[PDB]
Amino acid sequence: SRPLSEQNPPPVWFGEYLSRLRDTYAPELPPPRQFPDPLGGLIRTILSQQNTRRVAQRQWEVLTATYPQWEAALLDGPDGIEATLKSAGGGLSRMKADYIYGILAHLQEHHGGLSLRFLREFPHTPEGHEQARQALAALPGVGHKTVALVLLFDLRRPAMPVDTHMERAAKRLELVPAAWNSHKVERWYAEVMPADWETRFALHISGVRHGRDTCRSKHPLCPQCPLREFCPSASIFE
Ligand code: SF4
Ligand SMILES: [Cl-]
Ligand SMILES: [Cl-]
């Protein structure tokens, strides 16, 4: 019909929103994920979803102690993976084992191997980024949020993953309307943002911390918001 940034243009202060988020919540940027193989990083992202970061890090250590090669996890099948995930305290062990095992046995049957290293070889052009996006999207169970996370964290490609916490804040800011689902919010940010890996990385990290730590689902901390003078929603909460 018409690109989403046309139907809802960004505000004048949008650059100041980026600079307050960065200065407040991530003045020092964490490093990118440099795992041996992008497949490790995708598994790492799955572990962290609907999880505490404390258990997610524990499951990663235990999963890779248990399966030094991802080939070992494939041979163990979803039941052994589930046992391994559950042994580290996870709460979604059956679902995630079927998910992870489905990605592995998919790679093996259709690529003869369990490696995503070919994702690194696509050109760093607009087309090549879209090639890597498409390749991640062909994997069974991997949705747009997880595609963007792996592009941003594991491949240094300028995707624009937006976390649920960040989306909730953007809507309270009325940067984007309530009608829009997560995939549209992601597309809008990818249109309004400079296509620079670092700046998008800085936004994702800073935007999550703000939405998680300041703009909480219940009882947001509007008076400590650096974005307070900009947010229409501050008056409702305060
Ligand atoms: S002003 Fe309040 S509701 Fe608006 S983004 Fe900041 S914390 Fe969230
Ligand atoms: Cl790996
Ligand atoms: Cl789990």
Short mmCIF file of C-alpha atoms and ligand atoms in Angstrom, two decimals:
data_model
loop_
_atom_site.label_atom_id
_atom_site.label_comp_id
_atom_site.label_asym_id
_atom_site.label_seq_id
_atom_site.Cartn_x
_atom_site.Cartn_y
_atom_site.Cartn_z
CA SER A 1 0.00 0.00 0.00
CA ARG A 2 2.61 2.54 1.22
CA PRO A 3 5.74 2.09 3.40
CA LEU A 4 5.14 2.39 7.12
CA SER A 5 7.35 5.44 7.62
CA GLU A 6 5.04 7.29 5.20
CA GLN A 7 1.88 6.43 7.17
CA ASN A 8 3.54 7.43 10.46
CA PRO A 9 6.51 9.78 10.19
CA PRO A 10 9.08 9.90 13.01
CA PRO A 11 9.10 12.91 15.35
CA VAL A 12 11.42 15.91 15.19
CA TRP A 13 13.10 14.77 18.43
CA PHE A 14 13.77 11.23 17.14
CA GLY A 15 17.52 11.81 17.03
CA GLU A 16 17.44 13.13 20.58
CA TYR A 17 15.51 10.02 21.64
CA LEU A 18 18.40 7.96 20.25
CA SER A 19 21.04 10.06 22.00
CA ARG A 20 19.30 10.05 25.38
CA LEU A 21 18.75 6.29 25.21
CA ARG A 22 22.40 5.74 24.34
CA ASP A 23 23.83 8.20 26.88
CA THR A 24 21.58 6.94 29.71
CA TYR A 25 21.33 3.18 29.26
CA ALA A 26 24.30 2.04 27.15
CA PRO A 27 27.03 4.69 27.08
CA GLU A 28 29.49 1.77 26.91
CA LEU A 29 28.36 -0.81 24.34
CA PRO A 30 28.67 -4.52 25.08
CA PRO A 31 30.60 -6.51 22.46
CA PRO A 32 28.89 -8.33 19.60
CA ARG A 33 28.46 -12.08 19.83
CA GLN A 34 31.53 -13.69 18.27
CA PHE A 35 30.70 -17.36 18.75
CA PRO A 36 32.56 -19.94 16.64
CA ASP A 37 29.57 -20.43 14.28
CA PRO A 38 26.41 -18.34 13.80
CA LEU A 39 24.49 -21.53 14.69
CA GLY A 40 25.83 -21.20 18.23
CA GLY A 41 24.47 -17.68 18.43
CA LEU A 42 21.03 -18.67 17.19
CA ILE A 43 20.86 -21.41 19.81
CA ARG A 44 22.09 -18.87 22.36
CA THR A 45 19.22 -16.52 21.41
CA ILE A 46 16.65 -19.31 21.67
CA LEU A 47 17.94 -20.20 25.16
CA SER A 48 17.55 -16.61 26.26
CA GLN A 49 13.94 -16.27 25.05
CA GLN A 50 11.23 -16.48 27.73
CA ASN A 51 14.00 -17.13 30.25
CA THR A 52 15.88 -15.38 33.01
CA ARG A 53 19.33 -14.30 31.88
CA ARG A 54 20.75 -16.26 34.82
CA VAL A 55 19.25 -19.57 33.72
CA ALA A 56 19.89 -18.77 30.03
CA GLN A 57 23.62 -18.38 30.67
CA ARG A 58 23.61 -21.53 32.78
CA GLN A 59 21.85 -23.54 30.05
CA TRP A 60 24.40 -22.30 27.51
CA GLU A 61 27.35 -23.46 29.66
CA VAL A 62 25.70 -26.84 30.33
CA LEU A 63 24.49 -27.41 26.76
CA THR A 64 27.98 -26.79 25.34
CA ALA A 65 29.70 -28.77 28.11
CA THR A 66 27.35 -31.60 27.15
CA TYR A 67 27.64 -31.16 23.37
CA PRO A 68 31.12 -29.85 22.47
CA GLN A 69 30.08 -30.20 18.82
CA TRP A 70 26.54 -29.44 17.66
CA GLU A 71 26.75 -32.81 15.86
CA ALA A 72 26.57 -34.38 19.33
CA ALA A 73 23.24 -32.66 20.04
CA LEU A 74 21.80 -33.87 16.73
CA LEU A 75 22.65 -37.51 17.49
CA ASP A 76 21.16 -37.20 21.00
CA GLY A 77 17.77 -36.23 19.57
CA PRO A 78 15.19 -33.94 21.16
CA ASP A 79 14.81 -36.15 24.26
CA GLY A 80 18.47 -35.79 25.27
CA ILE A 81 18.53 -32.09 24.53
CA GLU A 82 15.42 -31.66 26.71
CA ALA A 83 17.06 -33.62 29.51
CA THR A 84 20.12 -31.38 29.18
CA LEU A 85 18.10 -28.14 29.11
CA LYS A 86 15.95 -29.23 32.06
CA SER A 87 19.03 -30.24 34.10
CA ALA A 88 20.16 -26.57 34.17
CA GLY A 89 16.82 -25.33 35.57
CA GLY A 90 14.95 -24.38 32.39
CA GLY A 91 11.20 -24.04 32.33
CA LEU A 92 10.48 -24.69 28.64
CA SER A 93 12.67 -27.71 28.06
CA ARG A 94 10.46 -29.88 25.84
CA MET A 95 9.41 -27.03 23.53
CA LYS A 96 12.93 -25.65 23.09
CA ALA A 97 14.47 -29.08 22.53
CA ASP A 98 12.02 -29.81 19.72
CA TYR A 99 12.76 -26.34 18.32
CA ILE A 100 16.56 -26.61 18.51
CA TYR A 101 16.56 -30.22 17.30
CA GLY A 102 14.30 -29.24 14.44
CA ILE A 103 16.80 -26.61 13.31
CA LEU A 104 19.72 -29.05 13.55
CA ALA A 105 18.15 -32.00 11.72
CA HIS A 106 17.01 -29.44 9.14
CA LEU A 107 20.54 -28.13 8.56
CA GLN A 108 21.83 -31.71 8.32
CA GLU A 109 19.26 -33.03 5.86
CA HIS A 110 19.21 -29.99 3.57
CA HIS A 111 22.84 -28.81 3.90
CA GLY A 112 24.74 -31.96 4.86
CA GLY A 113 26.03 -30.12 7.92
CA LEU A 114 25.24 -28.08 11.01
CA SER A 115 26.94 -24.76 10.33
CA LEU A 116 25.63 -21.29 9.56
CA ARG A 117 29.05 -19.93 8.53
CA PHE A 118 27.83 -19.39 4.96
CA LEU A 119 25.70 -16.54 6.36
CA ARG A 120 28.92 -14.56 6.86
CA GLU A 121 29.82 -14.75 3.16
CA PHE A 122 26.85 -12.85 1.71
CA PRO A 123 27.80 -9.36 0.48
CA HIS A 124 27.39 -6.53 2.96
CA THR A 125 25.04 -4.79 0.49
CA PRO A 126 21.29 -4.25 0.82
CA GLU A 127 20.71 -7.41 -1.26
CA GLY A 128 23.19 -9.54 0.70
CA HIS A 129 21.71 -8.60 4.06
CA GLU A 130 18.33 -9.61 2.68
CA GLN A 131 19.89 -12.88 1.51
CA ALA A 132 21.06 -13.64 5.04
CA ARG A 133 17.67 -12.59 6.40
CA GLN A 134 15.91 -14.94 4.00
CA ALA A 135 18.25 -17.84 4.85
CA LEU A 136 17.61 -17.49 8.59
CA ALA A 137 13.86 -17.19 7.90
CA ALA A 138 13.80 -20.54 6.08
CA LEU A 139 14.62 -22.29 9.35
CA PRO A 140 11.75 -24.17 11.02
CA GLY A 141 10.34 -22.15 13.91
CA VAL A 142 12.52 -19.04 13.56
CA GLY A 143 10.41 -15.87 13.54
CA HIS A 144 11.26 -12.33 12.52
CA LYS A 145 12.43 -11.28 15.99
CA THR A 146 14.96 -14.13 16.11
CA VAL A 147 16.12 -13.45 12.53
CA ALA A 148 16.89 -9.83 13.39
CA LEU A 149 18.66 -10.75 16.63
CA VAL A 150 21.00 -13.14 14.82
CA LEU A 151 21.66 -10.64 12.04
CA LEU A 152 22.49 -7.91 14.56
CA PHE A 153 24.34 -9.91 17.23
CA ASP A 154 26.08 -12.64 15.25
CA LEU A 155 26.66 -11.29 11.74
CA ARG A 156 27.28 -7.54 12.20
CA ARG A 157 24.53 -6.83 9.67
CA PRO A 158 22.32 -3.75 10.15
CA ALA A 159 19.10 -5.48 11.12
CA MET A 160 16.87 -3.72 13.65
CA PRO A 161 15.52 -6.14 16.26
CA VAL A 162 13.04 -4.48 18.61
CA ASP A 163 12.37 -6.14 21.93
CA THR A 164 8.94 -6.37 23.51
CA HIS A 165 10.14 -3.93 26.17
CA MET A 166 11.30 -1.45 23.54
CA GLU A 167 8.07 -1.80 21.52
CA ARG A 168 6.00 -1.07 24.64
CA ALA A 169 7.94 2.14 25.20
CA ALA A 170 7.76 3.23 21.54
CA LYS A 171 3.97 2.86 21.74
CA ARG A 172 3.76 4.79 25.00
CA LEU A 173 5.84 7.41 23.16
CA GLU A 174 3.37 7.11 20.26
CA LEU A 175 6.39 6.77 17.98
CA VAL A 176 4.24 4.00 16.47
CA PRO A 177 0.51 3.29 16.77
CA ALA A 178 -1.05 0.57 18.89
CA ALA A 179 -2.49 -1.12 15.77
CA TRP A 180 0.93 -2.26 14.66
CA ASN A 181 2.13 -5.75 15.51
CA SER A 182 5.76 -6.55 16.32
CA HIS A 183 6.78 -7.18 12.73
CA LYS A 184 5.52 -3.74 11.64
CA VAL A 185 7.27 -1.98 14.52
CA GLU A 186 10.48 -3.67 13.40
CA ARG A 187 9.96 -2.57 9.78
CA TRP A 188 9.23 1.03 10.83
CA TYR A 189 12.44 1.26 12.87
CA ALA A 190 14.41 -0.28 9.98
CA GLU A 191 13.03 2.48 7.74
CA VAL A 192 13.57 5.42 10.07
CA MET A 193 17.05 4.35 11.21
CA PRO A 194 20.43 4.95 9.57
CA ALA A 195 21.65 1.66 8.15
CA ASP A 196 24.74 1.53 10.40
CA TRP A 197 25.34 -1.64 12.39
CA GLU A 198 26.70 0.21 15.41
CA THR A 199 23.88 2.73 15.71
CA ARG A 200 21.24 -0.01 15.42
CA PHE A 201 23.15 -2.14 17.92
CA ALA A 202 23.25 0.86 20.26
CA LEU A 203 19.50 1.38 19.87
CA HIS A 204 18.51 -2.23 20.49
CA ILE A 205 20.65 -2.50 23.63
CA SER A 206 19.69 0.92 24.99
CA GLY A 207 16.04 0.48 24.03
CA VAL A 208 15.73 -2.84 25.90
CA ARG A 209 17.32 -1.51 29.08
CA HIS A 210 15.05 1.52 29.00
CA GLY A 211 11.88 -0.48 28.43
CA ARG A 212 12.85 -3.17 30.95
CA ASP A 213 14.38 -0.96 33.65
CA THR A 214 12.49 2.34 33.33
CA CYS A 215 9.32 1.94 31.25
CA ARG A 216 8.06 -1.18 33.01
CA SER A 217 4.83 -2.84 31.88
CA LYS A 218 3.20 -2.18 35.25
CA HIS A 219 4.16 1.08 36.97
CA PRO A 220 6.61 2.68 34.50
CA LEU A 221 9.20 5.02 36.00
CA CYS A 222 8.05 8.04 33.94
CA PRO A 223 9.66 10.62 36.29
CA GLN A 224 13.12 9.06 35.75
CA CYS A 225 12.55 8.78 31.98
CA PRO A 226 15.12 10.79 29.99
CA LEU A 227 12.37 10.78 27.37
CA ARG A 228 9.88 12.40 29.75
CA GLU A 229 9.53 15.77 28.00
CA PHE A 230 8.66 13.85 24.82
CA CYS A 231 6.23 11.18 25.99
CA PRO A 232 2.47 11.76 25.80
CA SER A 233 1.95 8.76 28.12
CA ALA A 234 3.85 10.27 31.08
CA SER A 235 0.77 12.27 32.11
CA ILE A 236 -1.48 9.20 32.29
CA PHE A 237 0.99 7.37 34.55
CA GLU A 238 2.03 10.39 36.61
S1 SF4 B 1 7.43 8.44 29.52
FE1 SF4 B 1 6.67 6.68 30.73
S2 SF4 B 1 5.36 5.53 29.30
FE2 SF4 B 1 6.51 7.04 28.02
S3 SF4 B 1 8.32 5.84 27.26
FE3 SF4 B 1 8.99 6.92 29.16
S4 SF4 B 1 8.56 5.42 30.82
FE4 SF4 B 1 7.49 4.65 29.05
CL CL B 2 29.06 -22.26 17.83
CL CL B 3 14.28 -24.48 28.97
#
